[PDB]
Amino acid sequence: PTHLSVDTKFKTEGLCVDIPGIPKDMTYRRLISMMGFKMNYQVNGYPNMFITREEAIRHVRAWIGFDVEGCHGTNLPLQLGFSTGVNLVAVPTPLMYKGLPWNVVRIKIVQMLSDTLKNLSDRVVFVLWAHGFELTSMKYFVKIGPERTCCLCDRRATCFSTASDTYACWHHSIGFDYVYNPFMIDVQQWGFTGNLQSNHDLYCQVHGNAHVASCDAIMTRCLAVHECFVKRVDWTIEYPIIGDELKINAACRKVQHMVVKAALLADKFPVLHDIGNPKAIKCVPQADVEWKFYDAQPCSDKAYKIEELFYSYATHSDKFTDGVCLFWNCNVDRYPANSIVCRFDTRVLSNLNLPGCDGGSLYVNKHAFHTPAFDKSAFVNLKQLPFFYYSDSPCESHGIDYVPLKSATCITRCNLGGAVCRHHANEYRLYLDAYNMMISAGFSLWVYKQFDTYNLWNTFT
Ligand SMILES: Cc1ccc(NC(=O)c2cccc(F)c2)cc1O
Ligand SMILES: [Zn+2]
Ligand SMILES: [Zn+2]
Ligand SMILES: [Zn+2]
Known part of the structure; x- marks a missing residue:
């Protein structure tokens, strides 16, 4: 009972507006397959892209809220928002950036996560309130495979470069283009009634909802911190040394x-x-x-x-x-x-x-x-x-x-x-x-x- 079985059920009700016709009966295994990742029955440190609440809580330093809004599905542009306040627009062809293709958007994603996380964590945990576009967008900036180490240090690899065919940690990833072996957790699996804004706003008056993607990403992480560290508290969990x-x-x-x-x-x-x-x-x-x-x-x-x-x-x-x-x-x-x-x-x-x-x-x-x-x-x-x-x-x-x-x-x-x-x-x-x-x-x-x-x-x- 350490890692989340890929054969666990994933409730799909939240996804059925971006993905109409989605089966009610769905496993992580079939969801990960649908997102376009092949886990080639592999036992090399990465059994699931998705993790338990418990695992998310041991890794709270790695949390980055992530939201995607259909800006007007390979057809259309996507607004990528993160709990860092960053909004990127990806074209298929508070900080708000104009439309660019995936091949440059993905470089900015690696730079941003690296600079945010290198002094915090050995990984990223994407905290979702999943509606579908965030999950189907991951193939455009994420690669997976066996656990690896940085090409310049002993730290676990979090990034990959197609140019050099090498792997880096957050410290060593300058010019890298893909997020490697990210983790993720869908807060909508925790059994809430009603939407993100209504659940968030019960507990918090500080994060508004300007109806941009970073606003949702921030609210999603906020709601998750409330559920795991305010309403519920576990003072037994230890956290590694990372500073003074x-x-x-x-x-x-x-x-x-x-x-x-x-x-x-x-x-x-x-x-x-x-x-x-x-x-x-x-x-x-x-x-x-x-x-x-x-x-x-x-x-x-x-x-x-x-x-x-x-x-x-x-x-x-x-x-x-x-x-x-x-x-x-x-x-x-x-x-x-x-x-x-x-x-x-x-x-x-x-x-x-x-x-x-x-x-x-x-x-x-x-x-x-x-x-x-x-x-x-x-x-x-x-x-x-x-x-x-x-x-x-x-x-x-x-x-x-x-x-x-x-x-x-x-x-x-x-x-x-x-x-x-x-x-x-x-x-x-x-x-x-x-x-x-x-x-x-x-x-x-x-x-x-x-x-x-x-x-x-x-x-x-
Ligand atoms: C400085 C200070 C802190 C706390 C208290 N509280 C009490 O004396 C008390 C007695 C019985 C039950 C209870 F819940 C509280 C008094 C103080 O002067
Ligand atoms: Zn390194
Ligand atoms: Zn909040
Ligand atoms: Zn003296």
């Missing part, structure tokens, strides 16, 4: 210990309310405070209402007003004034952050986390946390060449005393680097307005 995942996760642990340690030293809160991941550990384990945990899973859909987190049914809610609240990636509509907050900025551009549903983003770093749209109004009671480095650690080298550090934000005994020691300068530069890493990954840090780093200097006396 480890450095970023380490940075977030370092910034969290630093900021909460400094807050406790500066304002000496008697109680900390730690709201969010039910597996969360004390980020400052030596600190004096009453540490009280509150369980909330990552909200995939809408930010939590603070009122709902405090709603206690027939018992009294704990008083939040006492001490400080820590929301470390726990996304609520409006934070209380006495909060420390880490909140992921869905708008950030990175290889980890994929476009999501209704203005949210799918952040994929070991696990996949759909995050509700970033909203500045959530922080009305807070201010941005300023950068600072704090250490009570002794001034002591042990065992990196030097320019001496001067900074107002290096809060150590040595800087109090007039000259930063080498140990604290090394630690300061490492911590500035981790902080910059975390910010540029898309985390934003907010704090109660009374927070003042001036209060930290008298913890050395």
Whole structure:
């Protein structure tokens, strides 16, 4: 039960307007045959062009929505739209390109997928709401065969060139003309009522429907992300390393210990309310405070209402007003004034952050986390946390060449005393680097307005 049997049934109702007379009884095997591909009973890593929901979900980084509209069937021109916002017109003879033959259109398809996917995935998954023309158009830009490797590296082959008769991955495909061994999934097999627009629009107000093909392609991927990562969530599925995942996760642990340690030293809160991941550990384990945990899973859909987190049914809610609240990636509509907050900025551009549903983003770093749209109004009671480095650690080298550090934000005994020691300068530069890493990954840090780093200097006396 790993791969999708070619002898599985494919519901054909969706296809019968572009393909009138299509049999109600249809297998992937006969559909793939109809699309013009020969699978020559082959056991070489590519048993099916089509894949399971489960397989699509392991490969969410490879998803490209794809839609074709009959512009006025070998007879007529076709509008090719992709979730990248690109529209190509192919003649048989927002970005919108004039009519060209398949032999140039196919080169543009390879360039576009390569530049989109080379830092994301080892493959492409075309996400369809299939009506027929997208499926019969694939023969014009796709070739299949046994799994292969790039002619320049060890990565699996995703492209093919007729000019050179060679195979490339997404990194090495410049001037290649065919997509090689693509995958695909028809969202219309998932058992929806009514059309794409009506299903999409239930969940998402951000993607309009200008009635161009890219609009449908974007909506199709959006609906699919909603179904696989918002309504349903599976946090067991791991995802490969493709960038700075480890450095970023380490940075977030370092910034969290630093900021909460400094807050406790500066304002000496008697109680900390730690709201969010039910597996969360004390980020400052030596600190004096009453540490009280509150369980909330990552909200995939809408930010939590603070009122709902405090709603206690027939018992009294704990008083939040006492001490400080820590929301470390726990996304609520409006934070209380006495909060420390880490909140992921869905708008950030990175290889980890994929476009999501209704203005949210799918952040994929070991696990996949759909995050509700970033909203500045959530922080009305807070201010941005300023950068600072704090250490009570002794001034002591042990065992990196030097320019001496001067900074107002290096809060150590040595800087109090007039000259930063080498140990604290090394630690300061490492911590500035981790902080910059975390910010540029898309985390934003907010704090109660009374927070003042001036209060930290008298913890050395
Ligand atoms: C900061 C903070 C977060 C959460 C709560 N919530 C409760 O105390 C509570 C008690 C019983 C059932 C329940 F669902 C919630 C209070 C807080 O002060
Ligand atoms: Zn390669
Ligand atoms: Zn949408
Ligand atoms: Zn020092």
